[PDB]
Design a protein around this ligand. Structure first.
Ligand code: HQW
Ligand code: SF4
Ligand code: SF4
Ligand code: SF4
Ligand code: SF4
Ligand code: SF4
Ligand code: FES
Lengths: 756, 102, 166, 127, 127, 120, 196
């Protein structure tokens, strides 16, 4: 390693290190505006200037520590009066045309310019002499203000200090260049001719902007950065489980932000995770309902449990179903599992169970993916497991995990230059539609549903596929340690998953399975799958049932007793359900989940207004009491003990579990349930048109079926009746209608009809 | 860094607004160190032992309460004196139990 | 007999108890010096009838929580309240007593309505002697049955009459 | 000198013109920003006729095509400035007494501003 | 430390607490009625932590007039604790969102916090 | 900057047609718990717009904790009297007289109408 | 005059001499030599024992030798028999799991109350004390408040309709271990000192 010295301190540091990371690694400090973690440094703000001697031979001008590499035996000066003087001057030049909007600025206390100004600004000039703050007394720059860039993002071009973070992000991380400057000189400003902000990862600039330029509309003017109650937790909408920060105050959800955990998500959150919170704090069920005269009435927990005892008294344990949600915790999965061990029942399931479990395959860490050679992808990461995309963005640009300093993730990685090329030879994608990543996957072929299995047969070598499939086959044979990545569509078809397992077992290769359910791997690990009889989450097999999600309407039709444990009140539930009870969202829960990489993640409770809600742990404990069976779990601590007994490691620990069992089920092909980032229950408020449903058709098939390019067509699925806007698309095969799967119902091919 | 901007140039200078905002939400950060200086109040030597860790809030403040130790001389002074004079000798000891109890 | 059950006598005895309010000082902190100053020769609560000041609790009707109520003093003051004749009233003086005040910690009772039934609340730090005169007049008209709250209700003459002592 | 007064006074007239166009062509006009040296005056006196400093004409898609700004009450080189975003067009207008509002030496008449705004509307507006 | 009773079931909580209490002498024990919103008792909900010194007992938020029969069950509860000789009564004021997570923290943390935040109370406010 | 943390402010965005505040932001809900408030002047000192300024009323003695949270429309300069004083004048039908006199009101209290030493 | 001889005595025996540029002096003695050295200190002419300040460094940003630390103040009054005015401090660290200390009550009776306070506020038991009884905190109070792992134990502030505050979640001021609301705090918010 390279030896560096900052002002009194000497540090061993790997060679490719930036002077900024080495300075912070030594314990000193220097401003930072233009550069940002995971962003290509380019010297713009000129704040990180230090002094450098490389033998005593001081450099003539101050070196930009953001874009400068380090050499052995170098002296760095950040405390000389010259450095602080120059830094104060640059702070003045930055504050030059600022609007004086601090007190009403939504950025409030968490504004980098404020803190660096009060840190380094106004050097002590040499008395009791009266100081003057600013010299610039001229007419300041005025541009357009509170400019809504998108239903979630608002843009104030006056507060922009002309860094590059948002445009650099958009070019590098998502690969969607939908933001860049317009003019030059001091007249420069951010603008776009792409207005909707098409990228689905647009929300992350909301955090990066060191000023209040780009702000969250859905959380605009609620509270100041300190007034909010910050509770770090994990998002359970999808299996990547990025680390988030839930900002809550006075019982309502104010704003959701990114929490850095480089093992999984670096500093990023998706739009569905970050702006998809309007449903939590608006309308939700707070008092248990009981059915007395064929209608639901508020009830005491005592009277609800009385009705529970009477309704389940004559119940034999092989007719009771345990059907949980996809966000069911390890604690909950374990208690339902053990209870079905005691209570002999062949049918329990969970919301996003695949015909072939994701535990079939070896889990891979994302950084392993960065080190990998190849990625044979079947399905769309950007929708199925969003932030995978972002890691693919490092994967294909040859990026690799950086070296780890004392202050954690490095401030200036010299590995990331600007305008970096994205390689066409490092990944191959096969999807039923043309994914945003197909630009960067030279090997790409658009097929139709249920057709992967043939590509996988072709990759194994039993038959011959197209040119694209032969290219992916060859590149998969030649790669020394590739990654096979399976979407949702593959995971729901037994043969395709079987051939994937065979392919990725014969070649030493790990798998990243994008389940429609987040904690599907944890529920599998805890053993929540049906037995022989096996009435699945979509099957009408049981006679009494417990539901923590909303089943297809044919699942409720026919049962003798149905108890749903929801958070909202659903029309689907007040026509077939006998008892409804309030459940808290993952935002206000506590427990563990299992990542798509096998990694267990903590849920802390946030102080949101839950009502009289009770967790499925306590609900199942009370629901078994009507049946005689005693529950072993009521609390979190006992569940921790029984987990630790089951040998599931501590948080951030990866859970080792493999599985050999397939439950095949035929699939009736008329409509496709497009895997979507935006989820059904998120269509409240500003995400109402963003999380809208679509029905994609080819122009010929629309012309034959009479589907206009803008029509709100009502469509009936076994999973309910929903209306959906109709889109004409050239990549949708003829004869199929891709219906937006706004739930963990993706990858399913179902019958259906357009109602009039 | 130690004084908020004067109230009149809050509408002219950016540094004014930033310094006012910061000073009145966060405060200021004195250097790391311990300090103590004594003064004479109507009840004697007084002082604050201030431990600062360089943060916006003091690490510790320990107060030498003159009325606190000045009270040790109660059993002594009024020993052998009268029972009523135990009241006059307490009034003459001048305690302020906000200082003792603290 | 509780000063009730006659259209004339209840008015008469409420008059008597209200004007002859005899405070029982419990001097605790800096609020209590503002309670003492309400008797000096510039602004004296020595007119409405509160000239004399019964230090014994067996002889006084008004107990004023004057200062921060540290927890080690909570029970003693409790019994000082229980050592009062039943026709007794309690005013909560200051912010430290009414609510937790600025001292929001392990050492202070965060509302003295916990240990004693409060009649009147009087904010201030310390509430100006003239605010204390206003509160004793508030209580004056309260025990005559001449007090109404924000919600439209007339308030009972004597608080600490509605509590099942134990 | 005292010309200062009429400047801000004249500014209000300008706003009227701007407002008029919105009512004329049915395109969104918006008050962008008020005077900070008017918000942050606490007890201090304020004699100016209006407190509004920046406004703009936004299209249906929200992007403005015409920006107008005035120098704050205490700032040096007091003027009024105009700009067309995306078109690198800027104007420095002053007021010469007796003549009227002049862009340098050329008077700025209402008709000039109206034609300029219509050219911007046809050119820069997206929808 | 044991957790008996259940949320929002005042009568079942009271009967289970009757049974689990037994003949336990409370001469030196401590009763912490934890709630939110100091002033408004007419709509209050209550938890209980019983710190005997030799083992501790937990009752979740099931008592108070906020629940049907929580007022009568809380009256009976305080009468039961007072019959057994309790003299030291406390009340803890927590944020509503705390009340839920405070029953899931380890015993040392939960109990330390409660003892630090406790307010001496007159049981007459619950009888 | 409140050492008791007694001040509550929910914000909102001005309506251009009928704005409430000067900027783009106003105070929908402004509560101060006078039983928490210790009367520092730190809210006056830190207010950049000069809105929140201490007055002169001390006659705010009331009976109920829940009622001693003085709101926005309970403190405006337009209002003449304290909560129990206004309720007494309403349930009494007799106008409000404040029981204090000052030599003059400060320039920070522009609009504060009060009895000044006997000028009226 | 005696302070110079104190320094010459302690520096000769290799005890660290702590000094800030403000004019106050610290002298750190080890546990063994503590009692005998400070007895010699009183014999050296130190009339007055001002303070006993106990310290808990559990949450201090920089590490320190031991968690608890007790500081005594020895002074000789200027206006008494032969008063130089020499005042100085003695710091003595006390381990986290060994809260011991011999008393100087026998020398100065002032350590009667003061040490009790440090036993009341911190877990530090003072050896040789006549009466180590809780002074300030309630008799039934469990624990020692001033140590950082002991809660401050706050209560929320109350408002009209469900609107509350949790001050520890409300504080914008930063402690020493608080990273700040931005990525970090450098410069003048990591410590600032004017040069007169
Ligand atoms: C004495 O000083 C002080 O007191 C107190 C408490 C005790 C107290 C007593 C009496 C007796 C008042 C009293 C005075 C005069 C009359 N009177 O009828 O004239 C009646 C009663 C009032 O506050 C405190 C707290 C204090 O810290 C100091 C330094
Ligand atoms: S971006 Fe920062 S410096 Fe600029 S107005 Fe907002 S808080 Fe003030
Ligand atoms: S809008 Fe924000 S992130 Fe983008 S260039 Fe300006 S200051 Fe940087
Ligand atoms: S990618 Fe998944 S886990 Fe991450 S924020 Fe989006 S929905 Fe949540
Ligand atoms: S409210 Fe103020 S004056 Fe009264 S006891 Fe508390 S600190 Fe002292
Ligand atoms: S004067 Fe202002 S800052 Fe001080 S306690 Fe009252 S509300 Fe808080
Ligand atoms: S100049 Fe912006 S950080 Fe190097």
């Amino acid at each position: 390693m390279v030896r560096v010295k900052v002002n009194d301190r000497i540090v061993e540091v790997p060679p490719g290190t930036s002077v900024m990371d080495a300075v912070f690694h030594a314990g000193y400090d220097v401003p930072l505006f233009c550069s940002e973690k995971h962003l290509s440094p380019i010297g713009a703000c000129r704040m990180c200037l230090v002094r450098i001697g490389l033998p005593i031979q001081w450099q003539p001008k101050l070196a930009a520590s953001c874009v400068t590499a380090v050499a052995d035996g170098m002296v760095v000066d950040t405390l000389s009066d010259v450095v602080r003087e120059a830094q104060a001057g640059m702070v003045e030049f930055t504050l030059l045309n600022h609007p004086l909007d601090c007190p009403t600025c939504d950025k409030g206390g968490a504004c980098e310019l404020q803190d660096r100004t009060v840190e380094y600004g106004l050097y002590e000039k040499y008395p009791l002499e009266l100081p003057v703050y600013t010299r610039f007394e001229f007419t300041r720059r005025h541009v357009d203000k509170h400019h809504p860039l998108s239903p979630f993002v608002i843009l104030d071009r006056e507060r922009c200090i002309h860094c590059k973070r948002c445009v650099r992000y958009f070019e590098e991380v998502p690969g969607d260049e939908v933001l860049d400057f317009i003019e030059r000189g001091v007249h420069t400003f951010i603008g776009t001719m792409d207005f909707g902000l098409p990228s689905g990862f647009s929300g992350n600039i909301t955090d990066i902007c060191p000023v209040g330029a780009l702000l969250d509309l859905t959380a605009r003017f609620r509270a100041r950065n300190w007034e909010m109650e910050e509770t770090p937790t994990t998002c359970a909408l999808c299996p990547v489980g990025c680390g988030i920060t839930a900002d809550t105050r006075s019982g309502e959800l104010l704003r959701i932000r990114a929490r850095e955990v480089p093992e999984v998500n670096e500093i990023w959150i998706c739009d569905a995770g970050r702006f998809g919170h309007e449903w939590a704090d608006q309308n939700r069920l707070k008092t248990p309902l009981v059915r007395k005269e064929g209608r639901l009435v508020e009830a005491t927990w005592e009277e609800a449990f009385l009705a529970l005892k009477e309704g389940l008294k004559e119940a034999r344990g092989e007719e009771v179903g345990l059907y949980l949600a996809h966000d069911a915790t390890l604690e909950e999965g374990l208690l339902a599992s053990e209870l079905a061990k005691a209570l002999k029942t062949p049918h329990l399931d969970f919301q996003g169970r695949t015909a072939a479990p994701a535990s079939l395959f070896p889990p891979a860490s994302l950084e392993d993916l960065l080190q990998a050679d190849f990625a044979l992808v079947l399905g769309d990461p950007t929708e199925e497991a969003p932030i995978l995309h972002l890691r693919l963005s490092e994967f294909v640009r040859d990026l690799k995990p950086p070296h780890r300093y004392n202050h954690g993730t490095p401030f200036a990685d010299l590995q990331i230059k600007e305008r970096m090329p994205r390689r066409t030879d490092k990944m191959a994608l096969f999807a039923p539609y043309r994914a945003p990543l197909m630009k960067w996957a030279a090997i790409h072929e658009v097929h139709r549903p249920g057709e992967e299995r043939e590509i996988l047969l072709a990759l194994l070598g039993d038959k011959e596929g197209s040119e694209m499939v032969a290219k992916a086959k060859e590149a998969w044979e030649k790669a020394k340690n590739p990654v096979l990545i399976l979407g949702a569509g593959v995971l729901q078809d037994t043969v395709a998953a079987e051939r994937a397992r065979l392919l990725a077992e014969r070649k030493g290769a790990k798998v990243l399975a994008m389940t429609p359910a987040a904690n599907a791997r944890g529920l599998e690990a805890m053993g929540v799958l049906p037995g022989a009889k096996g009435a699945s989450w979509d099957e009408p097999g049981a006679l009494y049932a417990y539901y923590g999600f909303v089943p297809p309407e044919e699942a409720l039709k026919g049962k003798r007793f149905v108890v749903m444990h929801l958070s909202h009140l659903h029309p689907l539930a007040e026509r077939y359900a006998h008892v409804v009870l309030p459940a808290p969202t993952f935002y206000e829960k506590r427990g563990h989940l299992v990542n798509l990489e096998g990694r267990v993640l903590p849920l802390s409770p946030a102080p949101i207004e839950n009502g009289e809600a009770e967790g499925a742990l306590q609900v199942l404990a009370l629901l078994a009491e009507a049946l005689g069976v005693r529950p072993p779990f009521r609390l979190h601590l006992e569940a921790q003990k029984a987990l630790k007994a089951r040998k599931v490691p501590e948080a951030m620990g990866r859970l080792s579990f493999r599985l050999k069992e397939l439950r095949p089920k035929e699939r009736k092909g008329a409509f496709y349930l497009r895997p979507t980032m935006w989820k059904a229950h998120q269509a409240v408020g500003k995400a109402q048109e963003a999380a809208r449903a679509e029905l994609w058709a080819h122009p010929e098939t629309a012309r034959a079926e009479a589907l206009p390019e803008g029509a709100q067509v009502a469509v009936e699925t076994p999973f309910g009746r929903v209306e959906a806007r109709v889109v004409h698309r050239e990549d949708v095969p003829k004869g199929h209608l891709y219906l937006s799967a706004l739930g963990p119902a993706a990858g399913l091919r179902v019958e259906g009809r357009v109602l009039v | 860094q130690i004084t908020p901007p004067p109230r009149h140039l809050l509408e002219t200078s950016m540094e004014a607004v930033i310094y006012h905002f910061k000073h009145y939400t966060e405060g200021f950060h004195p250097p790391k160190g311990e300090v103590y200086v004594p003064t004479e109040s109507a009840r004697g030597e007084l002082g604050y032992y201030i431990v600062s860790d360089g943060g916006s809030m003091p690490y510790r403040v320990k107060v030498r309460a003159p009325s606190f130790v000045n009270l040790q001389s109660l059993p002594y002074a009024c020993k052998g004196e009268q029972v009523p004079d135990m009241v006059a000798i307490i009034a003459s000891l001048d305690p302020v139990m906000g200082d003792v109890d603290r | 007999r509780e000063g009730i059950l006659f259209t004339t006598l209840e008015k008469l005895v409420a008059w008597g108890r209200s004007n002859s309010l005899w405070p029982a000082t419990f001097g605790l902190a800096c609020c209590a010096i503002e309670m003492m100053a309400s008797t000096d020769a510039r602004n004296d609560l020595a007119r409405f009838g509160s000239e004399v000041f019964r230090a014994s609790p067996r002889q006084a009707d008004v107990m004023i929580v004057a200062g921060r109520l540290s927890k080690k003093m909570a029970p003693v003051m409790r019994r000082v309240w229980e050592q009062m004749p039943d026709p007794k009233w309690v005013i909560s003086m200051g912010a430290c007593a009414s609510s937790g005040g600025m001292f929001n910690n392990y050492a202070i009772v965060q509302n003295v309505d916990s240990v004693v039934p409060v009649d009147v609340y009087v904010p201030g730090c310390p509430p100006r002697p003239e605010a204390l005169i206003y509160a004793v007049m508030q209580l004056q008209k309260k025990v005559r049955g001449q007090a109404y709250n924000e919600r439209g209700e007339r308030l009972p003459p004597v608080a600490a009459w509605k509590r099942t002592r134990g | 000198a005292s010309s200062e007064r009429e400047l801000y006074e004249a500014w209000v007239e300008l706003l009227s013109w701007m407002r008029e166009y919105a009512q004329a062509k049915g395109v969104r006009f918006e008050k962008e920003a008020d005077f900070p040296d008017f918000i942050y005056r606490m007890e201090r006196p304020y004699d100016l006729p209006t407190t509004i400093m920046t406004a703009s004409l936004s299209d249906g898609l929200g992007e403005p095509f015409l920006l107008a700004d005035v120098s704050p009450r205490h700032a040096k080189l007091k003027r009024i400035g105009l700009r067309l975003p995306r078109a690198h067009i800027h104007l420095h207008a002053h007021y010469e007494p007796g003549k009227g509002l002049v862009t340098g030496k050329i008077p700025l008449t209402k008709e000039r501003f109206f034609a300029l705004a219509d050219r911007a509307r046809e050119a820069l507006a997206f929808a | 430390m044991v957790r008996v009773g259940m949320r929002a079931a005042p009568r079942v909580s009271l009967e289970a607490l009757k049974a689990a209490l037994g003949g336990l002498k409370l001469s030196e024990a401590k009763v912490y009625l934890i709630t939110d919103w100091q002033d408004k008792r007419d709509q209050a909900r209550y938890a209980l932590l019983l710190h005997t010194g030799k083992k501790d007992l937990l009752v979740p938020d099931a008592f108070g007039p906020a629940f049907p029969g929580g007022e009568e069950a809380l009256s009976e509860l305080v009468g039961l604790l007072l019959a057994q000789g309790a003299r030291r009564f406390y009340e803890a004021v927590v944020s509503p969102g705390e009340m839920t997570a405070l029953l899931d923290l380890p015993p040392e943390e939960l109990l330390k916090r409660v003892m630090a935040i406790a307010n001496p109370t007159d049981p007459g406010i619950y009888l | 900057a409140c050492p008791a943390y007694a001040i509550y402010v929910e914000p909102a965005e001005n309506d251009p047609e009928n704005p409430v505040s000067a900027g783009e932001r106003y105070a929908k809900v402004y509560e101060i718990n006078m039983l928490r408030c210790i009367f520092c002047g730190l809210c006056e000192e830190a207010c950049p717009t000069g809105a929140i300024v201490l007055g002169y009323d001390f006659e705010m003695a009331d009976y109920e904790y829940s009622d001693l949270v003085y709101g926005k429309e309970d403190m405006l300069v337009d209002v003449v009297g304290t909560k129990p004083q206004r309720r007494e004048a309403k349930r009494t039908g007799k106008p409000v007289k404040v029981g204090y006199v000052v030599p003059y009101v400060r320039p920070e209290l522009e609009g504060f109408k009060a009895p000044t030493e006997g000028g009226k | 005059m005696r302070l110079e001889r104190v320094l010459e005595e302690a520096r000769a025996k290799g005890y660290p001499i702590e000094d800030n540029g403000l004019g106050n002096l610290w002298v750190v003695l080890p546990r063994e030599r503590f009692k005998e050295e400070m007895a010699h200190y009183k014999a050296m002419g130190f009339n007055f024992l001002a303070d006993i300040v106990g310290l808990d460094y559990l949450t201090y940003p920089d590490p320190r030798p031991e968690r608890f630390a007790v500081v005594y103040e020895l002074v000789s009054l200027p206006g008494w028999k032969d008063g130089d005015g020499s005042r100085f401090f003695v710091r003595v660290y006390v381990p986290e799991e060994d809260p011991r200390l011999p008393t100087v009550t026998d020398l100065w009776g002032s350590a009667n109350f003061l040490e009790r306070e440090v036993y009341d506020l911190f877990g530090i038991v003072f050896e040789g004390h006549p009466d180590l009884r809780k002074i300030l905190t309630p008799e039934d109070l469990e624990g020692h408040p001033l140590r950082k792992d002991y809660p401050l134990g706050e209560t929320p502030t109350l408002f009209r309709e469900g609107r509350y505050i949790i001050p520890a979640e409300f504080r914008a001021a930063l402690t020493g271990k608080d990273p700040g609301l931005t990525f970090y705090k450098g410069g003048s918010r990591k410590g600032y000192r004017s040069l007169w």
